Design a protein around this ligand. Structure first.
Ligand code: F43
Ligand code: F43
Ligand SMILES: C[C@@H](OP(=O)(O)O)[C@H](NC(=O)/C=C/CCCCSSCCS(=O)(=O)O)C(=O)O
Ligand SMILES: O=S(=O)(O)CCS
Lengths: 47, 495, 194, 259, 550
């Protein structure tokens, strides 16, 4: 997982490109192209 | 200070339970939907699955063509046979399959006769006794109308009418009647006399609840669009258990609303939500009961139950008085107005009361509908509103069509129905029309309205739906304590 | 096993054969742990899916209050192109009564677009973790798509101060909730409360 | 010629109905709402921009020669080809100054080229947008036909014509298009007639006092003016009913002798 | 000799299938069957409890049942046996759901509605708006009322089988739509079939509405279209918020629910007075398109035989034995066409003969090929009946034999030529050849349409001419008699299975009934009927939640 990758949300399958990683409250968060934070454990890499 | 995120509370009245007229049961409005109420479904099922066959031509064929002698013992044997064959048992043709008896526990073949000597030596298991079920005067009237004739009532299983349509019932009864005839009298399985039996039981001596509607309407027989108002009046059995004319007319109004306005119009000719609050307005609270009792009191105070002959003046007087009283009651009590929030509900209730009053004054059903239409066009001027637009189509042409004699417009209100050209589309009219037709005869204390055979047939105690007190049964169904037939749980897996 | 005393509402129910609760009313369970929020006192919400959750929590040993919203039916006025049919809202006193509880359990319906915006308006004024009990399968991300704080899917620009802490699907309005759903709700409450 | 009456009756309600039906009767104006404010509440077009068209102007399009069709002078909105829009009102049963059938009859008696539809809790008139705005401001909103409390310009969700009024005497609204400003005592429209919020609320005046409502209403009520107190209207209604019945039975001069 | 029906005959009959003699009157009557004993016990309990002593089921009157051995019934291509009573349409929930799923289906095209919304109404239409409309209609179709708590609604658990689905021949729109309520042609059909169906459909969008089964149970079949139209209109005016007038709304209503509506059946005239969506209005091509075995099987005989089984179960059992006659019914005749592999064996022989002689589709339809193929298949079938006495005992009625042999002949002719009318001509030749062979045919009035058929097969007169795909139960010759219509549907399907066609008459019906959300899976009708006969079929329309438990 890194900026510019392609990820999909496992629960719904929304496709987007990772914009930035913005840790908060000692917890990793992933920002996609839809300006929505996600969780790395609920995201996985696709090619 | 204006906060747009406070919201607006809505529907306070609809949260409160709906009482049922002449009962003491409170039910939710969601439980009065015809899909959620098993009692309304069973009402329609019992009406749909009933066919009356006159077993007199068949006896004459057996006597004069086949040389077979018909005696009460032979009729008892035939009844025993048909009670086994009609649900789907096998009588001839070795190697048949049979329907599960658990799915046809509501299937009965009953016999009634106006001949007392023949009714005496008949098995009381299969006999609909007119003497026992009706008071003396009503029993005598029904026997005089029926005559020395024997009739068979076939109630095919409800599952049959639920899988198939309503046109299945007459054919089902005819096939089973023919089979029972050829196996009870030891005849050849197929000859000319068999065709005579089949023709008699298929159309010559058969009585259908509803006529077919071919063409544009496109429906088979025994559908709610084919049931005339007099037939539905004769289905309701309050006339033989109560002497209050208003109560009889109002039970017929409740049954007519629940059948026509709910089932026929909100499902057969519409869909989705349907028209539940349009129909329950006539049988939930005593509003219609109070208006009808006021109409009867006024009529008995100035005219009498049959003290006047139907003229225009009495129609104007009674309909105007009852309409003014009903609208004044709506004005005086905001609870009544918020109960009947829609204009159509109010218009139908006031016009039904006015028509019932005119019928109780004159004993004529066409005068009753004339009073109903006067009430509608007087309501319109009183409140400057009638109902949803599209409601007063028949109410505008009504006055002209009520006493008309032209081919497309003339019919006695007992002979009218949902297939009457004006009445064919709009809700909020038909159940009240049936009630007015019944009130035309409750004024005279008549035993029946249009068909004595239907009255005797639905006086049967083995029907699943109790037609003596339709509102009580509707309330029972709304409270999930009404047992309905047509369910198939013996052939289904455990859930 | 400890005594549980409820402050019954001060107003009566809906008529004779109707419901026992009244719209826009609150019944404090003394010790404030969980508040169950019902959209209306009607048969679609009260005693069929809501008092069942109430007695499940009260059986688990956790005191419960039940609040019936004054205007719980419909969609908020802030929904796209406004609301239709009815307007959903939360009163300041209702918000204060909710906010003194450790956790909130709220029962929602079928349509997803209605539930998301109703939850957003609800959490605009509620600052405690809440559990959404609905019928439809709704994912714990569509709320974040319109700005709602969510435990698993946070939004970049949060428009609410409340956190949707759990979503439970399969509870139908007006129908008895099976023991499995009650057990799931109780487990979520226990693990997200203490 | 023929000098028209307009309605039977001697009560104040019958007189008010006659006044609404009379095109030569100048309705008393009780407020002043600017044309742009009316357009904003109507919610169909943005004020200041040109009207959208449905067809070219009648001069551009070519029609066959029609002597009878060309006898009628068209509306200006028709001439320019403007689209047809609507304005809808809900009237309270508690002494609202105008009522659905009264509204429809007055519209078809006073305005040209209008489409009026009547429901129990609704009344809508459709016309070309420019003329619709003109007579909505001039007649429908500024005059006694409109009371900001008991009547409301509202499409979409209409409900409350038969419910009781709220604490300020305002008709029930499920969307709350108009709210009562207690500081100034005026009714302000916070949403347009379909329900989308307005950027700036528009002042539509203050609710008409209840005595004036009793004096100018067109509804019959047991508490204000009963139909029993107006036997002349009942007699005319009964005459219409009997004439309809006799004509539908046998339409001859002999059967109408029993009229 | 190896025959496909041999194994069933071994299982059904204790003696050798070629053995010409047996013994009777030693089975105890109706006691030999578990179904009859269960019926007797039930009847006793019901009589005593619910009927208050009025008798219901009396095996002691009428024929003494069970003088012979009551045989069990296999189901073709399925390894499960059932009694004949389990295959009665009233005792089988699978057959009831088969009719329910067809009855409650209406297909409505949504392209005129979109065009009217975009141009006349001035509302943008996007895949997001289509998804919103689909959500609205899925909530509102069963019983829902959108954002109106004060409105009465149907109990949700009462209509768990109600769905609203969408499909389209536009690929980009298809992949832009939500997969929750989409019928994906690409992933449901093979590549060539999907391409053919997309080309036939075009770039248009269609919605399928499955009205809940209970609605059709309480009401008739003509209720389905009205229910669908009303809910579609409500959902369209609720999803898209529109500021146009009411007349434009009327134009939109016509465009949305009165323009591109496809019904399963038409209304019937005369003494068959019935509304639409009744089994007597379903054309043979429509029923062939309803069955989805062309999706999962490349065997033409199997594709035709699944349509034969479905058509038998519908036309012969439900339509004819209940809608038109009633009583015990015509289960016998229909089970004869799908119980043992008798028709399977005959049809496989017909296909083999055609492939060896003329090729799979190697000849143009001429009279000579019709005559020789039909004669050969009929002779083979009749000698098969002759030399296997157990087979003749299994198909004891003449009608059931005639229909099976003639169906084999018609399927063979349709294989050879690819023309359905040639296949029906072969059917009629087979019927008269059967009559001359065995000096027998069906019942008294079985061959009304078989003597009139040869002349009406290729006729061009107004009331006599129609392609077999466009014929149905309302065709004047086929109106009354049992044992034909299901086989006619099978022959119509076989006309296209020979060409490898993706559909027979209507692509939209095929795609609509490819839907995985249906209760009855039309990919394997015989397997589902077998499941229903074992009381393991979950049917819909049960009012369990509105009835007392006691
Ligand atoms: C909400 C609508 C939208 C529309 O197209 N029709 C509605 C709604 C529709 C839906 C409700 C379900 C839903 O999801 O919309 C259905 C069931 C249509 C049908 N299939 O018969 C219905 N109305 Ni309506 N509708 C009713 C009624 C009414 C009364 C309500 C009066 C009031 O002022 O509150 C008025 C008609 C009138 O003005 O006279 C009315 C209007 C309206 N009715 C207008 C009003 C808003 C509009 O301008 O768009 N209903 C009633 O008067 C009671 C019976 C009730 C019907 C259902 C029932 O019988 O249970 C229902 C009958
Ligand atoms: C009384 C009739 C006249 C008529 O209109 N129908 C009958 C009887 C009827 C009844 C059987 C009633 C019962 O179970 O006792 C029903 C079910 C029709 C109904 N809905 O009532 C029926 N036949 Ni018939 N009927 C059948 C058949 C047949 C075959 C029987 C062949 C033979 O062995 O002789 C013959 C026709 C023939 O002339 O060849 C036949 C005749 C006859 N069939 C002759 C004379 C029967 C007799 O044995 O006395 N059925 C069959 O061929 C199998 C299918 C079977 C149908 C029920 C099912 O599918 O299970 C049944 C269908
Ligand atoms: C079958 C249909 O015929 P038609 O629509 O072609 O006239 C016919 N329906 C109607 O006449 C009209 C249907 C509307 C339902 C009744 C309205 S109740 S709520 C709507 C109030 S309004 O705003 O429409 O005035 C019927 O018999 O149900
Ligand atoms: O044998 S008949 O032709 O009468 C009917 C067969 S079921």
């Amino acid at each position: 997982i890194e900026i510019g990758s392609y990820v999909r949300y496992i629960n719904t399958g929304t496709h987007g490109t990772v914009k930035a990683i913005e840790p908060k409250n000692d917890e990793e968060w992933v920002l996609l192209e839809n300006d929505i934070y996600y969780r790395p454990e609920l995201l996985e890499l696709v090619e | 200070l204006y906060n747009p995120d406070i919201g607006v509370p809505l529907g306070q009245r609809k949260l409160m339970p709906y009482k049922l007229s002449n009962t003491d049961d409170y039910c939710e409005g969601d439980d009065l939907h015809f899909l959620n109420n098993a009692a309304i479904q069973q009402l329609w099922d019992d009406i749909r699955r009933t066919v009356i066959v006159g077993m007199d031509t068949a006896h004459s064929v057996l006597e004069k063509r086949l040389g077979v002698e018909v005696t009460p013992e032979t009729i008892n044997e035939y009844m025993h046979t048909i009670n086994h064959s009609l649900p789907g048992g096998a009588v001839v043709q070795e190697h048949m399959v049979e329907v599960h008896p658990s799915l046809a526990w509501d299937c009965y073949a009953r016999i009634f006769t106006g001949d007392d000597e023949l009714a005496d030596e008949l098995d009381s298991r299969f006999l609909i006794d007119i003497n026992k079920l009706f008071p003396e005067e009503q029993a005598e009237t029904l026997k005089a109308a029926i005559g020395k004739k024997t009739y068979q009532v076939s109630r095919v299983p409800s599952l049959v009418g639920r899988v198939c349509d309503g046109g299945t019932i007459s054919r089902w009864s005819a096939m089973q009647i023919g089979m029972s005839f050829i196996t009870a009298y030891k005849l050849c399985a197929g000859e000319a006399a068999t065709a005579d039996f089949s023709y008699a039981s298929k159309h010559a001596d058969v009585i259908q609840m509803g006529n077919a509607l071919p063409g544009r309407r496109a429906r088979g027989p025994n559908e709610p669009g084919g049931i005339r108002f007099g037939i539905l009046s004769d289905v309701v059995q309050t006339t033989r258990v109560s002497e209050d004319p208003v109560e009889q007319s109002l039970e017929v109004v409740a049954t007519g609303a629940a059948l026509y306005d709910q089932i026929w119009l909100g499902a057969y000719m519409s869909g989705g939500i349907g028209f539940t609050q349009y129909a329950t307005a006539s049988y939930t609270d005593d509003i219609l009961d109070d208006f009808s009792y006021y109409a009867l009191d006024y009529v008995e105070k100035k005219y009498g139950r049959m003290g006047t002959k139907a003229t225009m003046d009495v129609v104007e007087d009674v309909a105007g008085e009852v309409t003014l009283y009903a609208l004044e009651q709506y004005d005086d009590y905001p609870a009544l107005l918020e109960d009947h929030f829609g204009g159509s509900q109010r218009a139908a209730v006031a016009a039904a009361a006015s028509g019932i009053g005119v019928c109780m004054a004159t004993g004529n059903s066409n005068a009753g509908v004339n009073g109903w239409y006067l009430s509608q066009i007087l309501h319109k001027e009183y409140h400057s509103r009638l109902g949803f637009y599209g409601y007063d189509l028949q109410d505008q042409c009504g006055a002209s069509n009520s006493l008309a004699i032209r081919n497309d417009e003339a019919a006695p209100l007992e002979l009218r129905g949902p297939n009457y050209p004006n009445y064919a589309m709009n809700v909020g009219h038909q159940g009240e029309y049936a009630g007015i037709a019944q009130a035309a005869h409750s004024a005279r204390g008549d035993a029946f309205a249009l068909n004595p055979l239907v009255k005797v047939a639905f006086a049967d105690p083995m029907l699943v739906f109790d037609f003596s007190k339709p509102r009580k049964e509707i309330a029972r169904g709304a409270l999930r304590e009404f047992e309905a037939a047509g369910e198939r749980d013996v052939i289904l897996p455990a859930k | 096993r400890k005594e549980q005393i409820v402050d019954c509402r001060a107003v009566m129910g809906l008529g004779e054969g109707g419901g026992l609760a009244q719209r826009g009313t609150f019944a404090e369970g003394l010790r404030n742990d969980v508040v169950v929020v019902a959209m209306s006192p009607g048969r679609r919400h009260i005693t069929k899916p809501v008092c069942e959750i109430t007695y499940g929590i009260r059986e688990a040993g956790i005191q419960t209050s039940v609040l019936v919203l004054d205007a719980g039916g419909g969609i908020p006025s802030d929904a796209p192109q406004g609301s239709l049919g009815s307007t959903f809202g939360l009163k300041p006193e209702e918000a204060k009564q909710v906010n003194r509880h450790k956790l909130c359990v709220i029962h929602f319906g079928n349509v997803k677009s209605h539930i998301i915006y109703k939850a957003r308006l609800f959490l605009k004024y509620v600052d405690i973790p809440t559990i959404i009990v609905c019928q439809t399968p709704v994912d714990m991300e569509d709320f974040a798509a319109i700005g709602i704080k969510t435990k698993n899917v946070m939004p970049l620009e949060s428009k609410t101060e409340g956190k949707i802490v759990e979503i439970i699907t399969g509870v139908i309005r007006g129908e008895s909730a099976p023991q499995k759903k009650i057990d799931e709700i109780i487990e979520s409450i226990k693990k997200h409360l203490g | 010629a023929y000098t028209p009456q307009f309605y039977p009756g001697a009560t104040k309600v019958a007189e008010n109905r006659r006044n609404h039906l009379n095109p030569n009767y100048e309705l008393e104006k009780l407020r002043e709402i600017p044309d742009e404010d009316v357009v904003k509440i109507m919610g169909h077009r943005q004020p200041g921009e040109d009207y959208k068209t449905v067809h070219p102007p009648l001069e551009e399009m070519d029609f066959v020669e029609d002597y009878a069709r060309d006898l009628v002078e068209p509306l200006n909105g028709a001439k320019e080809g403007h689209r047809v829009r609507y304005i809808q009102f809900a009237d309270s049963m508690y002494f609202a100054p105008a009522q659905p059938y009264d509204r429809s009859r007055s519209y078809m008696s006073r305005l040209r080229g209008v489409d009026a539809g009547t429901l129990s809790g609704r009344q809508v008139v459709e016309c070309r947008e420019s003329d619709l705005e003109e007579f909505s401001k001039n007649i429908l909103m500024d005059t006694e036909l409109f009371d900001p409390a008991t009547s409301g310009m509202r499409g979409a969700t209409v409900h409350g014509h038969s419910l009781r009024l709220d604490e300020n005497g305002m008709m029930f609204d499920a969307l709350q298009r108009c709210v009562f400003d207690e500081k100034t005592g005026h009714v302000m429209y916070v949403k347009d007639q379909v329900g989308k919020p307005l950027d700036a609320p528009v002042d539509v005046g203050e609710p008409i006092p209840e005595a004036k409502l009793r004096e100018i209403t067109t509804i019959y009520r047991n508490d204000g003016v009963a139909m029993r107190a107006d036997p002349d209207v009942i007699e005319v209604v009964k005459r219409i009913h009997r004439a309809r019945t006799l004509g539908g039975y046998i339409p001859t001069n002999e059967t109408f002798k029993g009229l």
